[PDB]
Ligand binder design. Structure first.
Ligand SMILES: N[C@@H](CSOO)C(=O)O
Ligand SMILES: [Fe+2]
Length: 186
């Protein structure tokens, strides 16, 4: 039975229940994420920005079935085109706006990766991606407003691939946490 999360802490509690088993009800998880009304005081601890690129800040380790993290995107900061390592990946905006651009998996032949579509993700909205849907790039295109998002990945993963937009060629990248549980982890 899905109830509205009252706070971030409550959201976390609910996620532990939703991931208590071996499978994932994606629509239920997306609904609970969307229903949490972003309260900046509750996540300020995790919102650690870097001037030069976006940061990944671990919030909860999900007793193994998922990682929950907060990403902080300076003006103009964005990601590579990337996959999600056979995991579910949910992305809920906590502050600002992000542009998500979707791409198809490249063919083995070198070619420009053309965007299949794009959308603007707005405050409190929760998006979902997985490898079966495709690849994406996420960017804060604002010149004036930092963005903050909440991401949930299941199973957790710390490697993915970045794709070169001109060729489709991929490279394996290891993701790192800028902080964990509010603590900077250089
Ligand atoms: N997958 C990217 C963020 S865009 O993913 O919802 C990352 O975790 O760094
Ligand atoms: Fe992503």
């Amino acid at each position: 039975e899905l109830l509205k999360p009252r706070t971030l802490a409550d959201l976390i509690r609910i996620l532990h229940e939703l991931f208590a088993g071996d499978e994932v009800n994606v629509e239920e998880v997306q609904a609970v994420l969307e229903a949490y009304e972003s309260n900046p005081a509750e996540w300020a601890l995790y919102a650690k920005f870097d001037q030069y690129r976006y940061t990944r800040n671990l919030v909860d380790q999900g007793n193994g079935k998922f990682n929950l993290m907060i990403l902080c995107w300076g003006e103009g900061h964005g990601s590579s085109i990337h996959d999600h390592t056979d995991s579910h990946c949910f992305l809920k905006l906590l502050q600002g706006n992000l542009k998500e651009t979707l791409f198809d998996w490249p063919d083995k032949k070198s070619n420009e990766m053309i965007k299949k579509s794009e959308r603007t993700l707005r405050e409190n909205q929760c998006a979902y991606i997985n490898d079966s849907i495709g690849l994406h790039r996420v960017e804060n295109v604002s010149h004036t407003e930092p963005a903050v998002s909440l991401h949930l990945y299941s199973p957790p993963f710390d490697t993915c691939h970045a794709f070169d937009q001109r060729t489709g060629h991929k490279n394996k990248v290891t993701m790192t946490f800028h902080s964990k549980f509010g603590i900077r982890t250089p």
